[PDB]
Amino acid sequence: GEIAKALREIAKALREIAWANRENAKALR
Amino acid sequence: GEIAKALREIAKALREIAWANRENAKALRG
Amino acid sequence: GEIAKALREIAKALREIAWANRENAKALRG
Amino acid sequence: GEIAKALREIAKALREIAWANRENAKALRG
Amino acid sequence: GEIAKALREIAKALREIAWANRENAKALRG
Amino acid sequence: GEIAKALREIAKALREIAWANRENAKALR
Amino acid sequence: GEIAKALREIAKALREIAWANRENAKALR
């Protein structure tokens, strides 16, 4: 369904934030 | 539907946050 | 509808977080 | 409705995060 | 309702993130 | 219900992010 | 249900942000 597919896009975006934040920790190290 | 469209709007805004957070990592690199 | 309208405010608030985070990246760049 | 009201409360909390994050940018610029 | 109650805990958790992020801005000033 | 428990799961994860973010502030001091 | 599963995927992605942010605090220390 359209609602469940949108919620899965929100999850994917949050995983991209996690990856971006791991780039920061790398950058600090 | 209106609800699905608004949730996809939320996903897009979270992709904007991901891009901004990566620029923070790159500014610490430079 | 009231639920869709509130979801679109959530998206707008996330866009404001992205803007703030972009401001950080600029401040780090100096 | 109680769901819409709770979603608006989420949006307000996200606006608080945006203000906090901008203050991090202001504290880096000093 | 159980859904609205859960959404209000989401909002409360987000206000805790804002508070944590305001602590960061204070640590940077220091 | 399954939806409400999942939303409570989201709130707890956000409480983990608040703790982590505060640790970042503690590591600056 | 598909909606509850997608909400649980959102919670898992937020836990992945928390882990990133905990790592970021260790990299500052």
**Residue E22 tokens, joined:** 């305001």
Report which of B15, C18, B6, A15 is spatially closest to residue D15, judged by C-alpha positions. Answer: C18
Cβ–Cβ under 8 Å, residues B18 and A13? yes
F18 closest CB neighbour out of E2, E3, E17:
E17
Q: Judging by beta carbons within 10 Å of its beta carbon (0-12, 13-18, 19+), is residue C20 exposed, middle or buried? A: buried
In 10 A of CB F6, how many CB atoms? 21
Residues of F with CB under 8 A from a CB of G: 2-3, 5-7, 9-10, 12-14, 16-17, 19-21, 23-24, 26-28
Q: Which two tokens stand for residue G29?
A: 């220390």
Locate breaks in chain F with C to N over 2.5 A; list the residue preceding each.
Answer: none
Domain boundaries of chain C, sorted by first residue: 1-30
Resolution in A: 1.5
Give CA–CA dist D26/G5, Å, rounded: 40
